[PDB]
């Protein structure tokens, strides 16, 4: 596990694929680039 610094709830994660998508805990929004710091 690394630190991202990332927008609250959002975290940095990958599939089996390798496609790295993140995903927020609080809605469940998965985004392939990143959160902008727009939050």
Do not use: A, F, I, M
């Given at each position: 596990?690394?630190?991202?610094?990332l927008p609250p709830?959002w975290?940095?994660?990958?599939?089996?694929?390798?496609?790295?998508?993140?995903?927020?805990?609080?809605?469940?929004?998965?985004?392939?680039?990143?959160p902008?710091?727009?939050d």
């Amino acid at each position: 596990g690394s630190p991202s610094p990332l927008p609250p709830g959002w975290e940095e994660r990958q599939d089996v694929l390798g496609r790295t998508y993140y995903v927020n805990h609080e809605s469940r929004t998965t985004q392939w680039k990143r959160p902008s710091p727009e939050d």
